[PDB]
Design a protein around this ligand. Structure first.
Ligand code: HEM
Ligand code: HEM
Ligand code: HEM
Ligand code: HEM
Lengths: 141, 146, 141, 146
């Protein structure tokens, strides 16, 4: 579970992303594929080369989902209910792959926002991403 | 760890620009803030209550310098990581009893610190290279559990 | 998170434990200490030998807390609030050690109640123990 | 893995009483039920919708007998687990791309199945012996990731 200080830090850090959403989500996706090549098997139908239009398109979807998760932070299981059924039941994604994308999202956020990425904010974003991962791995038959 | 020749060059080139006094202390510092349970292994270090106190702690910075020195020692001996971390594996496993999952966490926090310090320069293929390194160091430090 | 069928199986399986709670908890703890020697360091003031009064005394406490968790399954964060503070803040227990005790609890449940340990109940109990683990590892400063 | 001579005895004595036709199929079966994400690796196996359908599936029982056969193969070669599982390490890692964390989960489900079958006989020190074995089998099968 989170904290009122965690929520403040996540809203503020992700607020300085804004228009740069699709570049950041795509960069996080690209960082994931090159670092952990096992994750590439969930996307065979995607052109995974540098500057790919599908990776850039999906990166936007990933980032918009994380924005919706920050919005409804107190009611995350309901807001990402469709996304949970998609990742858990349909695609059957391994829970470890979420820890790997979450890490890449933190590396991306560190590489782009050095003023926002304080140790306190690092702690908050890790907890947020871990909470999102928990919800997307939840499978209720 | 099977590192590509182009990846070996990218690592050493980036590592020569690393602030040896601050980076290591920031890695250990963040490990203690992001993952609080790691603080039980450092009861003798002092004030670790607030994030600023962990980062501003002299004992954390000084010990972090030695951790960074162990990473540098592993970068010069990529072919034999088991032997380079053999003594440190005995300390972390048989004496201190640190769970091997924490080794990976510190490696991933180091990657986050290198990203914070270099920005755009810590390009995606450079991260991929460092992920191979920090995973090799973790697995080598976890040998006494195998 | 859980399911209404998961809650039914957890209440049914744990209902057959009843009086044997302390024995099961103590056995679960002993299975953990022997299989994963790293967990012993959390109990340096305990006699860790077989048939120890302390391991028998603490097993009762762990089992009773799990019995209280089965009772307040719909509101576990509030019920084990004191325990969350204890395990995360004060004792600073590594989340991995919970996966290990959770496993040992399942091995104990398998070795004592084979009629109740059906594949569906194995799944239910794993998700219950993972939920109790999440609560006890949640640290709100 | 450093197994004590008394632990090597306890294992083989318990393994000789194992139903080779059912146990393995139950391990794989429960892996697919308890951890549903593992089913993506077995799309060609058929009906895996309900727990009873997973356990009653002929392809699961048959493949499970081969997994148990690989665990028996590892119990005869405790001194060289890397070489015994070298071929299987290539399959599970380079071809199929199974995360190494799942190897550890199957091993733990095997321990749960052995507990379900033997009861009181699967005493705490016997489990401790089997945990060393299943962890050794996991690390050996995960060698192509190191
Ligand atoms: C940080 C957590 C993640 C978020 C926010 C996220 C978000 C999304 C979103 C928004 C979609 C699009 C669904 C739609 O079009 O309706 C999606 C699809 C998908 N996600 Fe994720 N995802 C996450 C993690 C992962 C991970 C860890 C993997 C696996 C490596 C993954 C694999 C997929 C796949 C395979 C699809 C593709 C569907 C398509 O072709 O459109 N996702 N994800
Ligand atoms: C993979 C990264 C790691 C490396 C390379 C590393 C390296 C070191 C080094 C160089 C020493 C000091 C050796 C000496 O001069 O005696 C040391 C000590 C220690 N390390 Fe690590 N370490 C790592 C991970 C960890 C982790 C993740 C933890 C704890 C959660 C940890 C806890 C300790 C402790 C408690 C000490 C003893 C400090 C003292 O002397 O009071 N280390 N480590
Ligand atoms: C399945 C989850 C667990 C439950 C329900 C549980 C329950 C309890 C309870 C009821 C107490 C007693 C608090 C009191 O005296 O008022 C406690 C204390 C403690 N727990 Fe846990 N625990 C769990 C897991 C763990 C794990 C995994 C570890 C570490 C290996 C751990 C380490 C401790 C320690 C060190 C104490 C003893 C404090 C004392 O001496 O009084 N617990 N736990
Ligand atoms: C704990 C270690 C494990 C052992 C000893 C084991 C053993 C085996 C064996 C003996 C084979 C068949 C070799 C052949 O005849 O070609 C195999 C195949 C396979 N294993 Fe495993 N395995 C293990 C873990 C896993 C896990 C945990 C997964 C799944 C998440 C997995 C997925 C597969 C798949 C997909 C195949 C191919 C089946 C086919 O022919 O269609 N294995 N494994």
């Amino acid at each position: 579970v989170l904290s009122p200080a965690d929520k403040t830090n996540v809203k503020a850090a992700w607020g300085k992303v804004g228009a740069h959403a699709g570049e950041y989500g795509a960069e996080a996706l690209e960082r994931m594929f090159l670092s952990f090549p096992t994750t590439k098997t969930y996307f065979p139908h995607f052109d995974l080369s540098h500057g790919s239009a599908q990776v850039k398109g999906h990166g936007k979807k990933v980032a918009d989902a994380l924005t919706n998760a920050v919005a409804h932070v107190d009611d995350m299981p309901n807001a990402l209910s469709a996304l949970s059924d998609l990742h858990a039941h349909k695609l059957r994604v391994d829970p470890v792959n979420f820890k790997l994308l979450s890490h890449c999202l933190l590396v991306t956020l560190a590489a782009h926002l050095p003023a926002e990425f304080t140790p306190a904010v690092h702690a908050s974003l890790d907890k947020f991403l871990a909470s999102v991962s928990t919800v997307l791995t939840s499978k209720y038959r | 760890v099977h590192l590509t020749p182009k990846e070996k060059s990218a690592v050493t080139a980036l590592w020569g620009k690393v602030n040896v006094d601050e980076v290591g202390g920031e890695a250990l510092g963040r490990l203690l803030v992001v993952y609080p349970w790691t603080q039980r292994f450092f009861e003798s270090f002092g004030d670790l209550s607030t994030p600023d106190a962990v980062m501003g702690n002299p004992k954390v910075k000084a010990h972090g310098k030695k951790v960074l020195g162990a990473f540098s020692d592993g970068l010069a001996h990529l072919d034999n990581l088991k032997g380079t971390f053999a003594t440190l594996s005995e300390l972390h496993c048989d004496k201190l009893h640190v769970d091997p999952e924490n080794f990976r966490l510190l490696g991933n926090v180091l990657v986050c610190v290198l990203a914070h310090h270099f920005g755009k320069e810590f390009t995606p293929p450079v991260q991929a290279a460092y992920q191979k390194v920090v995973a090799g160091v973790a697995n080598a430090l976890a040998h006494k559990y195998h």
